[PDB]
């Protein structure tokens, strides 16, 4: 039972992928598997630009399930998680401060992030 | 909240929408009125709403 999508993908180790979120409602129980793969799929598409607004959703929902996690966890690792949401909150910044130069792009406005 | 939304629909905004939604499905009590309102008010404002947010609170809130 992975706690970390690091630990997987070290144990483990074509055209355009469609959005992430189409299978997203299939994991709804047992949400601590599903914390990896999103995990490998936000990191995946942070690089190469992440198209456009693909990452702010996938950080949207990380940042959900992060703050899902630790509510009733074990409390050992209550902590540490906790701590990594807030990293997804410095990447909010990023999600927010860096999302785009907003020169021609409309970005995306993170209310439902605020409203988490 | 809702007299703005109603007066005003033309200029707005997806976060107005989000907002009023938590704010109904937040539900402080339980009562079959206010789910068919919420019902009613989902169906006569749709393809407005983030499908897996509202899920996620939904099941949540049971």
């Given at each position: 039972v992975f706690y970390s999508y690091k630990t997987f993908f070290n144990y483990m180790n074509t055209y355009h992928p469609p959005?992430?979120?189409?299978?997203?409602?299939?994991?709804?129980?047992?949400?601590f598997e599903f914390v990896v793969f999103l995990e490998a799929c936000l990191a995946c598409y942070q690089?190469?630009?992440?198209?456009?607004?693909d990452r702010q959703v996938i950080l949207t929902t990380l940042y959900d399930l992060y703050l899902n996690?630790?509510?009733?966890?074990v409390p050992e690792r209550i902590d540490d998680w906790r701590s990594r949401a807030t990293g997804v909150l410095r990447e909010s910044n990023k999600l927010?401060?860096?999302?785009?130069?907003?020169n021609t792009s409309k970005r995306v406005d993170n209310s439902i992030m605020l409203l988490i | 909240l809702k007299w703005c939304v109603r007066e005003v629909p033309k200029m707005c905004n997806p976060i107005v929408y989000n907002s009023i939604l938590y704010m109904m499905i937040t539900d402080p009590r339980n009562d079959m009125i206010l789910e068919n309102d919420i019902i009613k008010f989902m169906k006569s404002?749709?393809?407005?709403?983030?499908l897996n947010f509202q899920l996620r609170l939904s099941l949540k809130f049971k």
């Open positions: 959005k992430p979120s189409i299978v997203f409602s299939s994991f709804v129980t047992k949400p690089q190469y630009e992440g198209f456009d607004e996690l630790a509510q009733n966890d927010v401060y860096s999302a785009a130069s907003n | 404002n749709e393809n407005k709403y983030d």
